[model samples]
Target: QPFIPPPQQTALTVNDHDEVTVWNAAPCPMLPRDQVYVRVEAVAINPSDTKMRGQFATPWAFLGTDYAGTVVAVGSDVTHIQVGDRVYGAQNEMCPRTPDQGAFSQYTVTRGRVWAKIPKGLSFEQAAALPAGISTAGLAMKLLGLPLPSPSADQPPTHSKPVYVLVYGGSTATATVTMQMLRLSGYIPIATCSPHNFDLAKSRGAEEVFDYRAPNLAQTIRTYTKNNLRYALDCITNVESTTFCFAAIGRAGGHYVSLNPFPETRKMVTTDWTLGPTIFGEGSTWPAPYGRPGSEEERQFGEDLWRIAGQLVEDGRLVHHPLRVVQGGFDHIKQGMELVRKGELSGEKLVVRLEGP
Candidate 1:
């Protein structure tokens, strides 16, 4: 007998209001030539999911991003991935255009070139926690014009001497990956976090962790780096974080990169910024205040970064953010996202597991 997809798959969908509910009937789209269909077993929620639920309103749109699962189908032009391979990726979900692309569903599809095939031994939940963070981290590494270039699968990026960098919000998921990638790439990362999460920052790859609240914190960073700091990444991407990161750079001047664009064009240093979704590919536009064009270079760099990350994980040099696995599938996506929105979670990915517990 010929196989066919079920009429509909259960999913978490959103309305025009600030709401997301379990809808037992959401259509799954056909596989495009550059996409792969995943039988989603686990999903991880990001801070964007809840923020977009209210801002990027589209009725009945699928409502999640990071996911890991087994591939049930691959499109005609796809390469490297085959059916039955375990994979994980992040999609620009909640877009009005691609309603079924999100991961909070029993079935989902993501770009062929971007998602990584999970190496043996990674749990679906652990893998789910990685895509969004890694995608953002890798994309930032490519976007920021640091002395270090994009990483290759064969080896990490290198320079003659270790470049000292600062990561604001060191306890954040993206920061964890950013710090690790920089260290693995021969750069020294110093981070700012609460004293409580200092160990979290250190173990993730920071050479030194400082309290963001301390007086002259930025000066402290400048002194600690001995006026050699030339790069900073604002994983927090707020007014304070941006200003703080900008101040941490040495007198010689350097690059300042943020997850979101700076509110105003500051002087002297290059105020470069990167958006996570720009790697989805060319022509995609994010919602305003972050309308990053998915440029060709951005997408190509992202694909290379994803492949490098896969290799790092396979070799055990990379680690995912801590996970708080919340079961009950579609029933708990809303609750788990709310926890993130309400500031309940600290340095943990809220993974909603649908398969093995």
Candidate 2:
């Protein structure tokens, strides 16, 4: 089947300063039914975006993962969001049905499940900063055997024994947000960061923060946690860093989640969870991949968990990470990548302004 883009879809391009262009492309149209189209106003760039641009493996690679904007149009099936409502979500270009994924544009669309109402107190930039990091963090916690915030008193929380969780590379976007979400769910978070970021990580809900560059960081963490640490989140997937954290994680029953793949042989020692590696688009892959939202309990559980996160944002208990918004449009992509490569950005998100007035 030939896919037809609406006449309004515009050409969204990125360049040196990470500046973007929305002039040539057509404005994205709203989905057919039970969906909504968002006019993206701001974009927050994650490391994955920079990684994709540097590798440039596929021509279709776009430079955004999360965005915030207003709903300009809606499909009949969508009643949760109406036209003109401010919203944000974690979306990407991999799924053709998700318009918001290509967030460096004037407009985009996606199913209601992926979209959430932006809290009244949040700015477009702050709202734009969520979606990707929070969604991934939310899913990561769910994978760790924690219970979703129950809607009904009768529903019991998951029975997975609570374990001391150590997060490696706590200065990153995912690590910071994951740490906060963990606190919300009743788990203690021990994090690794540079000396300068220790206070910041603690402010974000880390019970303890260790300097990863320290020679005996693993021993320090083990000593503090009384050797009870068995779960870890490795934000930096570098071989040495991950392996060192793995060693600190102790024996076979410990679980390790990463943004990248682990060595096949090393997989034997720990339970592995891959966020956005295999599970992100799995719902579209096999039959009933994520489980039908309308049918299965597990499917509904995911839906409800996302809703809970959305509510947290609305209440202001969960806040966006610090961000530096780039002034240019898509043309600034190159410069943005340069900043990421240079390691100049720390403890903050790099947000690019896209659609302008």
Candidate 3:
């Protein structure tokens, strides 16, 4: 039987401050040459989704970034994927160069370069939780100049020396995935989160976990790594977190990546250090240099990262963060966004099931 998307579909939209509404939207146009159309089954909410809705007053902008679904249609040039394939990916909706690329609708379009197959035995909900986290983390690792892991080979390469890494806000979705990626690449991950999530961070491969609120947190990290830490990723890139991670690096200096922009006030710890910002929302643009969003380089990097991470998940080396599934499906998105805006969630992914039998 041929698969046909509905002419119209339900979607969540935002037009004003702290407001989101369910509206009937026209089905997205036919796939572009390098894109695929997906029948969205589940979505995971990120702080970006809420933050963008609140900040961008653009009327009728569709909202959503992370999604998991089955492909119902594929573009002519999409050789890597086909119809009926179950897939998951992060959307470039908020910053998309096109009008109909968001993922909140029942049918959404995504570039072929940014989507990946969902390994068997994983639920749509689980796959949906990964795109934003994985993409952000992948970009961070790239900026940190860390090597990608090759676990499929008969004899995988291993790091020769201990590379201590600091992950501030280790409880964040990005941090959780970042820890696993760093660990798999043979780095020693040290994380700072609320004491309550110490075990959570440790389970995600943080070798040492500290309380973010501990007195002299930077000193604590320095003490733990013996001031030898040379890599840091700030998942909660604020002035204080950035300063602490900056201070924790050794005198020789090292690389730092942040999910947020670096503060101008904080002087660089050393002239030799590198600081990078990871923004995954931007869609693909040509000739992507480092730290620039939506580059072909990032798209290719994301493709590799998603493929590798899918295998890791299949091998049980990577796991989704604890999930808190909202009960009311699309109708619950508003409530979920409010909770996210209020910062009520901790160390877990909030997912909404969009389709059911």
Candidate 4:
């Protein structure tokens, strides 16, 4: 028999005024044939969670960007997963028109193709920390035009052909995955982060890690790359980050990609940002620069990337970002978002486990 979910469930949602808290959700339709219903075990917090609230929400809209759990129900059209398969995925939930979220429910269903079955030896917390970062990193490879890696061995070769790339916010969860992706794709990833996270960055495939606040950091990177840097992935897409990333590129100028929309960018280089939700097979009606019309090509790419990422982790080619489990479950989302907003969590993810011990 197909799994049966409750008509109404407790979900963490935003109020009419965008205030976030728990609410008994209105009964939605049954799981789509293309979607999966998960009994969410763990969820993760991202800076985007804080930025997407306020005016961008629908009344009582669900509110989480990443989740990990067991698939208890699968749509008739869903073939790669089945009941009891552990999985993790990312999806934007703010858009009411084409809704998404499972990171905040007792049992939830998500509408998207950015999920993957968790491999053995991975915890629900670790898997929760992955979806958003890894999916973003996977998209960045195409956004910045890096070579797509087709893993052939347990640890893919990186030294055979090395293309140098810059990764700002190297210690960030997104950048952590980016560095690994770069290494797996045969690129030398030069990164910027705090001095304390140097070890963390290097361990995850960074060829070099420089403090972002260093004096003359731009020229410093130029000197390190021999002024030949041609590509960059900016995880912190702010005016300051844009300036540094643009300045560090070689004289020839190259592609600069950001995680979110930035206020300023200079000429002489191609700068663009990737919003992961655009590949979700559903359009987002949010305000300009933030919203997008979905694409069939990109959706197919995500589906393809999911299998590649799953196999890479299964073969030990990719490692998850470090995570710290906070007490309480969905009840602590408000506090967890603030902790990330206040910059308390370092080079690691803040995870919330819903299952009791």
Candidate 5:
């Protein structure tokens, strides 16, 4: 392949007042030794994008996370991918070192290990929906001590039996992937969502779907699982969901993972239970400056998770979350963000085509 010179790119950036706008950006710099430069073709809108936009007090900060594109350049140390390889993955642009690093731009640089080639027959729009949800759910599964299914590990050990896993907010993007992963790992996955999304959740591999609004939700889950439930993941991570999950767990106690910080009411609910939050950002620390270390390990783990998800997708074992393609390219991001913020989207991802007419 011939060398492709970097091009001047346009990126979506936020102003100090939280206004979203597109600006002409300078070409992104060459990647570090292990990185690859991707010319973004399609990108997905995630809640993190909206949350980060609200947190941006400084002007000209780019915002985006999930993206699909083709490699235009590769660093010397990148061996798995090369120019013209179609790939899709999430970016850590929420904590970007510079404006050009965000996935909203035409060119974004990411480490080679963090992305996977787009599987055959998958479109850029469909592949763009996987990264944020899949990676976050992968980390949640690991934190919850759930098994990852591989050819050798496909069956549960004779001594170990499958447990009922509760996936709250099951119709959400993260829960959709989480349910599929849980099922593939040989565990039973039950999900909670609005009654309207019960079919959607089941379609995504949820064995059973519970209506989150039911008055006897906890009792219903406990009875349905025969008091055998041992793990719960709160994808919504709100007060109601957290308290309900705590109630549904068996008397023997189990682990609970949440996407948001644990609420105060559930802080001391049970001595035998473990409740914690899982952060999926690539370089995030446990707390802050004085927090536990190992940025590189986190990045590598993210890479491994994406690769596993890619392989599963390629084998037709995993499916993309339903998507609603948002037209008008980068200009429509603010509208898409508003939909996510107002809780208007459920059971699907909103994708935007970047290379447009």
Candidate 6:
């Protein structure tokens, strides 16, 4: 069922990334251009939120990256969507490197290319689950030269090898989708998780799962790959995980992609596809040294991934990454984020209900 935004309550207090509080506020009027306003029903939480809150304590930061809801208002240029259209998208602090209202409120505004129409037969809860991880996974895949997953049988033939893609932390939303994308794109996904989460990783598309905490973990991976493994995705930027890959990922020059780029030794070269500063994170610290200005290759790649993920959800080929919707209004967001900070919740994401009756 579609959600209805309340009429009376108007303003909201933006708590850094993980925390937000709703208050009396005025309705955000429809803007010029193709801005579709959504009556948000569900919002998901991720580690990025916690990092933002801890690192950048900016008050008035409307913090919600994922959303599922119905469009109640549309600007004149918006022809793709109309009143009462259900949709889901990744509404980060600011979209496309520009600051705009985010998904923390009852209503959010977005442009045409940033969102995907919710597929028929999928729940709003399920549609809300794709954006953050899918966008990140898709960008990571493109940068790695991985082929896009074939949408239909009539699509062009795809070239895939049983290449090994090591996911440093398989349970995170990004890592989970990375594995799914790798498998669908015709590569093998090898992941590391706690033993308790081994089954979950396998079901999500891991060919082999190993406990990252094991004493001989790196050696074990070496033995398993028989020295043929060449590519790796370090979902967790922890020093140990990065060091382990540096110690092991050598078939005499393989690619290593880190969610967080730490100073390390890599003769094969290293890359950081952490979505860049334009999306979030300290882009100034790690600027795009490889490309020129106004280049849309990386940015367009991200947009295409969002569309593909939306289509995959419609087709039931991709399942929502593991998420547990925390049942609370705006007041509970702080607690939910605190849990993430404490690392109490494992192998699942915490999402909050944003606007409702």
lDDT of each: 0.80, 0.66, 0.74, 0.79, 0.74, 0.68
What TM-score against the true fold does each predicted structure earn?
0.91, 0.81, 0.87, 0.93, 0.88, 0.85
> Per-residue error at 288 for model 1, in Å?
3.5
Q: CA shift at 196, candidate 4, in angstroms?
A: 0.8
The weakest ten consecutive residues by lDDT in model 6 span 277-286
Give, for candidate 1, the lowest lDDT window spanning 10 residues: 145-154
Selected candidate, larger TM-score, 1 vs 3: 1
Candidates 2 and 4 compared: the better one by TM-score is 4
RMSD of each: 2.6, 5.5, 3.8, 2.3, 3.3, 4.3
Ranking by lDDT: 1, 4, 5, 3, 6, 2
RMSD of 6: 4.3
Residue 226 of model 1 has an lDDT of 82
Task: For model 1, name the residue pairs that clash.
Answer: none
Model 2 C-alpha lDDT versus the unseen true structure:
0.66
Q: Is candidate 2 or candidate 6 better by lDDT?
A: 6
lDDT of 1 at 64: 83
Residue range 1-357, candidate 4, lDDT tens digits: 866777777777777676777776644436888888888888899887776566766767667878889888888988868789998888667667534354666666755668888887898888888888878888888889876667675455646545689999999999988798888877899999999999999999998889999999899888787777899889888889988988999887788999887774445788778776765656566437655677798778887887788788777778888888876866787789889988898888989888543
Q: List residue ranges in candidate 4 displaced over 4 A.
A: 25-29, 98-100, 153-162, 265-267, 286-290
Q: Kindly indicate the candidate among 2 and 5 with the higher lDDT.
A: 5
For model 2, residues 1-357, the per-residue Cα lDDT tens digits are 222445664434444343433345444554667557777788777776655432232343244668788877777756767778998876654333343246656667653365588888888888888887767786677666655543332333333655578888888888888887777666778888899888889988888888887887788776776665778888777777677676676544477777555544354345555444222332432122463123344345445656877887787667788889887765564466568767889998888776464
Better of 3 and 6 by TM-score: 3
lDDT of 6 by residue, 1-357 (tens): 333445534323444454455554534534546567778877776666666543343465456677788888777766878788998877655222433455656667664355788888877766777777777787677667778786664433344545777788988778887787787877888899899889889998998888888897887887777766677888877778777776557567666787764554536745654653333221332233643243355456556666777677678777787778766676666677668778887888777765465
Clashing pairs in 3: none
RMSD of 3: 3.8
Q: For all candidates, what are the clash counts?
A: 0, 29, 0, 0, 0, 4
